[PDB]
Design a binder for this molecule. Structure first.
Ligand SMILES: COc1ccc(CNC(=O)[C@@H]2CCCO2)cc1
Length: 341
């Protein structure tokens, strides 16, 4: 069980003004810290956010959160479930800002909702330092779906924050799961308009080198992995199914020659954007998310599991028998026999 702590700085809030927070399970014999960002889409205007508040309120408010949560997958403390980091200090950060972890805007008389995802990450890091993070050797910032995009937008800011506070020995790294999307043509028209409306609504913030490349009005580009990743300085491992279900939903895909070619070309383009990503894991499967799933140990690429590939990454920071770049070449979902059923 990880235990809930609401933030001590109560001006850092979920959408509705209630305090944000984190779940923690300490491991006093370990100098490794894992901070996981939850996902869950986003909202981009008043009417859209009001609908979310009616039926997805735990993603907008801490008022109903439970006092504990079970750690699963990479957050499990059991060696049989988590061969990678079972002895680490475990942190789960709930997503209650609906801004893909980018916002830095308070509620006020002109704003019905607060969007403070980027500040929530900073405040969690600051309060953990007094609970033992000051002694860390590695801080791994991990996240799934919207949280995986949030890793890409925030890992370098966390590195900078710890450096400016006087902790230069803590190595900050990122793990982005199912957060790597393509702004491609759809199979059928109903696109990027939602994320363009949202960044304005949230006052969203993107990494500094990427904002300087794309410049004003075009910062929405930095929410797409293949465009922001080359600008990052911290080490980042990318996990992405080649046929991701949230990608295909937005593409209006639910088999004739036209659809076959469409699907095969999506997998080829995805494989192409990962070619110069040295630490990555990308199986040829139709699925979404993996790292906090209990059976995340099961899938393999070229005979290597995801927990093994992450261990090889730790060692690298080429190794005989212990690879770190694992991308499937076969062109159709579930051409890899280890795909989840
Ligand atoms: C075809 O164009 C798209 C395909 C997939 C998505 C899904 N991803 C998101 O909506 C957010 C914003 C960007 C990163 O995550 C969005 C547009």
């Amino acid at each position: 069980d990880l235990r809930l702590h609401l933030l001590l700085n109560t001006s850092v809030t979920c959408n509705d003004g209630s305090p944000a927070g984190y779940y923690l399970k300490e491991s006093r014999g370990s100098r490794r810290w894992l901070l996981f960002l939850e996902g869950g889409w986003y909202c981009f205007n008043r009417e859209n956010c009001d609908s979310r508040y009616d039926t997805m309120r735990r993603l907008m408010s801490s008022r109903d959160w439970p006092r504990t949560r079970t750690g699963t997958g990479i957050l499990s403390s059991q060696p049989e479930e988590n061969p990678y980091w079972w002895n680490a200090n475990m942190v789960f950060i709930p997503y209650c800002s609906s801004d893909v972890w980018s916002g830095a805007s308070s509620k006020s008389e002109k704003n019905e909702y607060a969007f403070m995802g980027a500040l929530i990450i900073q405040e969690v890091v600051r309060e953990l330092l007094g609970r033992g993070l000051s002694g860390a050797k590695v801080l791994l910032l991990a996240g799934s779906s919207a949280g995986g995009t949030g890793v890409l937008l925030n890992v370098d800011r966390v590195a900078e924050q710890l450096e400016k506070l006087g902790y230069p020995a803590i190595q900050v790294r990122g793990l982005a799961d199912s957060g790597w999307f393509l702004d491609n043509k759809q199979y059928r028209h109903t696109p990027t308009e939602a994320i363009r409306r949202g960044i304005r609504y949230w006052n969203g913030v993107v990494p500094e080198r990427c904002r300087r490349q794309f410049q004003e009005g075009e910062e929405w580009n930095c929410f797409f992995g293949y465009k922001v990743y080359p600008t990052l300085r911290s080490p980042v491992f990318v996990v992405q199914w080649l046929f991701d279900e949230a990608q295909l939903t937005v593409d209006n895909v639910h088999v004739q020659e036209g659809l076959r070619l469409y699907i095969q070309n999506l997998g080829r383009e995805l494989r192409h954007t990962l070619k110069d990503v040295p630490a990555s894991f990308a199986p040829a499967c139709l699925s979404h998310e993996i790292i906090i799933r209990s059976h995340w140990t099961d899938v393999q690429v070229k005979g290597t599991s995801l927990p093994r590939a992450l261990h090889c990454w730790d060692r690298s920071l080429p190794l005989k028998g212990c690879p770190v770049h694992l991308v499937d070449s076969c062109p159709w979902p579930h051409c890899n026999p280890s795909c989840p059923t």
